[PDB]
Amino acid sequence: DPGFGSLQRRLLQQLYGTLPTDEKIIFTYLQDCQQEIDRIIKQSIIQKESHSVILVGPRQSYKTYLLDYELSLLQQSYKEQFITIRLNGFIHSEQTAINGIATQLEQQLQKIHTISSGSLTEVFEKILLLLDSSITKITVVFIFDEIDTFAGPVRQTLLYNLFDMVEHSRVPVCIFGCTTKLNILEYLEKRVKSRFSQRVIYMPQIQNLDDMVDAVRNLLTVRSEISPWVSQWNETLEKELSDPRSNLNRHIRMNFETFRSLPTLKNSIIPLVATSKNFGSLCTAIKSCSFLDIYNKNQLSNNLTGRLQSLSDLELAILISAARVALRAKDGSFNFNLAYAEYEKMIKAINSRINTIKLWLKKDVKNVWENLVQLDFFTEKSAVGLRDNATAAFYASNYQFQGTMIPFDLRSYQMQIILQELRRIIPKSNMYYSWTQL
Amino acid sequence: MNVTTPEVAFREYQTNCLASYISADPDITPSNLILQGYSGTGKTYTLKKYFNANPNLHAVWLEPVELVSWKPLLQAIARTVQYKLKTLYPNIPTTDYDPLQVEEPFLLVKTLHNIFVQYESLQEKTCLFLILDGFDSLQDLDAALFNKYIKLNELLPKDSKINIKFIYTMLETSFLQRYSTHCIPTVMFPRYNVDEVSTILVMSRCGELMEDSCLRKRIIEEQITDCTDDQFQNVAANFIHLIVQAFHSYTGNDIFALNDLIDFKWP
Amino acid sequence: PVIRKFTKKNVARAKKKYTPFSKRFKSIAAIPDLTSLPEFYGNSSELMASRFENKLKTTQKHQIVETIFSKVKKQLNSSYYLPARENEFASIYLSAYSAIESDSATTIYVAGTPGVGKTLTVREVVKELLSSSAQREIPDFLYVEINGLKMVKPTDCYETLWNKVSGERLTWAASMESLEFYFKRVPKNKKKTIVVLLDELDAMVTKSQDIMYNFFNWTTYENAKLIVIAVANTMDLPERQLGNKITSRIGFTRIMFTGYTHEELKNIIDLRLKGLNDSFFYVDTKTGNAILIDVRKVRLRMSADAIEIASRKVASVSGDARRALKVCKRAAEIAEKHYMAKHGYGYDGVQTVHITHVMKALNETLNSHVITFMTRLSFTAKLFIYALLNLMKKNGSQEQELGDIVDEIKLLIEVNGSNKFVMEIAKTLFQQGSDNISEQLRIISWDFVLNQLLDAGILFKQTMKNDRICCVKLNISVEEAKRAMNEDETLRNL
Amino acid sequence: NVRMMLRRSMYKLYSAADAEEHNDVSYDLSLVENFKRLFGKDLAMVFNFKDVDSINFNTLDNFIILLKSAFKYDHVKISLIFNINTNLSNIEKNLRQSTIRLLKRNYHKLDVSSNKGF
Ligand SMILES: Nc1ncnc2c1ncn2[C@@H]1O[C@H](COP(=O)(O)OP(=O)(O)OP(O)(O)=S)[C@@H](O)[C@H]1O
Ligand SMILES: Nc1ncnc2c1ncn2[C@@H]1O[C@H](COP(=O)(O)OP(=O)(O)OP(O)(O)=S)[C@@H](O)[C@H]1O
Ligand SMILES: Nc1ncnc2c1ncn2[C@@H]1O[C@H](COP(=O)(O)OP(=O)(O)OP(O)(O)=S)[C@@H](O)[C@H]1O
């Protein structure tokens, strides 16, 4: 039937939040936060005040979700009243955010009704004396994602001038900064903190298990009659949440104890619904939740236990042999020569007490040695893998490290998985299990 | 949905999730998606086999290993997106923007904003999949570059007719765990078994081991002309089962090391 | 053409001339009277600066409600006669009145901690002596705002000063030779006195200190008629950057603004409330709109001890007037939203701002949230901190190896296996609930909560690719981490 | 490093193809795929590594693997020339094992010396 195919499509676009903006789901634990964001936007767009504020919470804490919700709800009532500027501390720099404001200023002002052209000292002084300076004004709303990278230790020019428009400009300038850092005010300079209006509002957190039950209840309830299966779906999902010993309420409880983030459970429900062929299987799959065990097995199937279980016998024997040399060493370090010496005296002691097991040569374990390097079982000794930013990754590419230049079998390595962890994962029926203990 | 799931051999969970996230409707598709697996785990195979079984949803295939720095990676995005849309919609009048003019992560956003507004006469919402195939294999890679591509969706216009969608492919799972709190969906491609490597290697290579001239030349020239295709297929299949059972402990669960030891030892 | 090795396709170059001012009249005697000359001293620039008021105008306006507390927040803004800087007004005004009246040149240096009224009262000095000059008791002058943090480059102050003097757009290396020829060579009969304000002089001198010397050396000239009011933050910025023999040669005055006392904060806050405190409004009971002198005659008093404790707390920390005007603006909107929620006006007998509204406005900027954040984390995230705090009392090394934290988490579920909470969670934390997933090395969401605490700023982690020997600090304190973990019920018993 | 090997290699082929030809290009391995679509003739590029005993073998291993990605383009062929001053046995202990399996589909050892055979 096409009724189920329309029952999937709404129930899946409720799980992405792409409902139109009067049907969008606002959970009850972040209503008092979105009412505080609602008050700030519409006494700056309707009532033309100029205050700034920083939103702060973790990643995937509905900071950009609530700002996109509040502007879209003011989009439909007050379209002509405001232009919106949004920057982002990842893709913008100190130099590039000047071009990003002026490009978005001139293209938002065409839709209601040049600035962006010239040198960078020209394009910055034109957006100043535009902004710094019965008919009413256009209010300009700024949105910052990762304002904490604009609040670096060095200069902080761009945060100085925008907070200087909150205090002194005759243009009403609303500024949202979405950061993650709890100590965001200590990144700011003394001049930049003094201009800022000191309002830093903290995104709410899930406090109870019943907050996640009510928020999954709001995500999986269809509030209109689109399909013949809507009432039959809604009475199934209310039985699965009223029963505390149900399997769906068991997977919510594991999320509350481990992740406590509803977007992580949201990625689990999405292929439980989209990979359901008919309503008979879609009603069954949320009763049993046998997909969420298969999903959670996949997400964690090549982390470090799933890579150790995908090894051959020589790859496991070299991994054990390098884990015994790393336990005797004081620095946890080993070579290819040290780990093949422990390997060959292990294969001797197997074949002496015992048909026989092949001892692979020095030239043949070299391929096994390099695969354990690229599967993150061995790391280079004092190694800095990825750098923080782009200049530190560029400085490291011009330096020629020592372990590159020394020969192959002399490189000191270290150990991702120690021998005491390596005894616990390998089963007791392996012939190499006796060698996971000194 | 309204999509076709192909039959990849030992990736039947991975293809059902791949059909679950990738669709033509942009409202029910995530703007980021990672396909993580290690080398040889069949994740460009089933990514390609999914898009061939679904021809009416559109893909731009980029390899970030032959682009080496972050700046050629931005320029190739601007080049191949507008080259895709010209073949895809020839009736739309457009003015070509120089892809070599982007030198910033923002100048990509401004160029993609300029490319997408002139396809505004299209009839419905359409998603173009920008497949960064091997994003972790970029040589100059750092921690602060992948969270610069997560957030491009928020800087591009929300009511455009063309919604770019990023599909990432990456290897090493220590790169992936740096971005765990972004909660963007990930499909894992674990390593194959010894029985999964042998079945894949025997359906991939028994075709070439017949059309190889060395087996072709010898059977007529040795003057033993008493054979069929079903013996031809079984003599090459039993070599592959014998070249694995000897050298599995040396190679491991590779595909590319087994493919080299076949053709070095088949003549 | 040739094959280029790299391309620059986004170069946008300004139309700025290269030849300085010393090469366009061929003689000092051929320089005309620069005051009676059209393009100097901003006699035509008043058309383009007023162009951008028309861009942000729209014709829609539908009766926005202006309640009782909206009028108070409008009057506590920093942009809206100043009581507590009187001796500092009389020092800057006396030093600048004498140099303009005598056709002299000087430099006034003024410093202080942020927010103490020094950018305000220098602008109030030059507004008083604009009004004195407009009455013709001192000659006419030209006033230039230079802000160091309103410049892209530090060298843009040369461009912007010479543009305000001459109306000419030159590069910076041509602007400082234009200014240096202007101040020492051009005669005093041909020029006009110039009062330039070098605001936020810290920002211009961070890289090369070539910019603070030039503005101060130009004031030592005889022919120059230049008054540099140089406002910065610290008092030793001239002597550190320039040296001891240079700062003695210039001979500038040196004023410091001390941060305000609590009694001076009261005469700033209550000075901006003289028109509204103890006054009567006309509030209709169906929209909420107030009108200063269906409708009640309500009135508005703000409590004087509320302004007292807002002044005692702000002046004891920093002493700036911004943090006290926006702790009373914040208190005025806390009182508005309760007035807005009781009657339900929305947006389209006596009201007061209590002691509890000001304390609520003041407590939220002084509290930390790292306590409240960590009591409401996962069990997994709180188990990470609780294992890290046990390691910092086994050693006190205050940066723990990350593999020592993993073995502690496993040992802590090892030992407390009789516990009622730990028996039922260890199945859902090593296999993640059901079977068919093997028992694993890290707890479920170990990469999630380690990245959750690094993103929050609670936790510092060094850069190592070996995920086991990597080190982990805290960034908050050991005390307020233990205070958050002795509140949680299940961790404090084990 | 590896990006300086490629930006010089893509500059040396784009400069030497405009010399034989009688717009600007990003110098990366996307010039190899656009070579027939911009010059009309197919390519045959030859690499001549000069002092390969003085180069580090982390960079040369990662550059051969980078050139391996140009075997999907149907109109190019690469040819490597290694001026090994000392020894072949020293080189195969330096490169990774999966690279030597790539170098062995067709290799040719040519003894080049003033001292060979006198
Ligand atoms: N405009 C939007 N409409 C609907 N859902 C959205 C929107 N923006 C984000 N979401 C979803 O909201 C959830 C989390 O909200 P976010 O706003 O992304 O959290 P966040 O605070 O922005 O995280 P950041 O930006 O990385 S710090 C995710 O499932 C997103 O897919
Ligand atoms: N399930 C499968 N069925 C059939 N052939 C497969 C399967 N998985 C892999 N192969 C083949 O084995 C080889 C594996 O290559 P890829 O799929 O490209 O590996 P990969 O996952 O992309 O790993 P990297 O990162 O590119 S080295 C190809 O020749 C595939 O055609
Ligand atoms: N004595 C005062 N009387 C009245 N209002 C004052 C007084 N001092 C400061 N203000 C107000 O508070 C604001 C603070 O401005 P200033 O203190 O002059 O700036 P500032 O001293 O340069 O601080 P910076 O820029 O960080 S060095 C002024 O704009 C006034 O609105």
Ligand SMILES: [Mg+2]
């Ligand atoms: Mg965001």
Ligand SMILES: [Mg+2]
């Ligand atoms: Mg691939």
Ligand SMILES: [Mg+2]
């Ligand atoms: Mg100031």
